[PDB]
Design a protein around this ligand. Sequence first.
Ligand SMILES: [Ca+2]
Ligand SMILES: [Ca+2]
Ligand SMILES: [Ca+2]
Ligand SMILES: [Ca+2]
Length: 148
Amino acid sequence: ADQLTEEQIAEFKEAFSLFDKDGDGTITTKELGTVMRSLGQNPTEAELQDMINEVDADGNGTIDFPEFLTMMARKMKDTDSEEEIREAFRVFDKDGNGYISAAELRHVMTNLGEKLTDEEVDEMIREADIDGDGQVNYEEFVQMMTAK
Ligand SMILES: [Ca+2]
Ligand SMILES: [Ca+2]
Ligand SMILES: [Ca+2]
Ligand SMILES: [Ca+2]
C-alpha cells in the first residue's frame, strides 16, 4: 500500500477478486497460476511458489490483500515487466485496435468467472482513463502498472 497510488490500490482490490476463485479471502498458489496464465503470463510452478513465498509475510502459505499489494508493487519492477504488461494488455484488447473497451473488459471478467455490474466496469475504466475517451489504451494501461 505504501508503494501504490490510491487509484492503483482501488484497481487491485478488484484484481484480488479475480484471483480469488472460490472467494475465500485468500489467493493460493494454484489460483495464482490459473489466473496469471489467463492474463497472458506463463510462470512455472517454481516461479509461482517463489512469488507467493516472497510476499507471504505471515508465512501461512497463502496471500491476503495486503500481501497481494506487495506482490503487485514488486511485479511492476520485474526485469521483464514491460513484456509481461504487454502480454496482459493483449488479453484484454480482443479486437486489437489498441483500446480496451467496456465490452472487452466485461469479456475478460466473465471468462474469469467474475460476476460484474456496469457501475463496476465503469469505475475500473474511470480509474485508468486519463484521456477520458471511455476506454483504456496501452499507454494508460502501462501507467496504471508503473511504480511511482
Ligand atoms: Ca481463494
Ligand atoms: Ca499470508
Ligand atoms: Ca479493443
Ligand atoms: Ca482512455
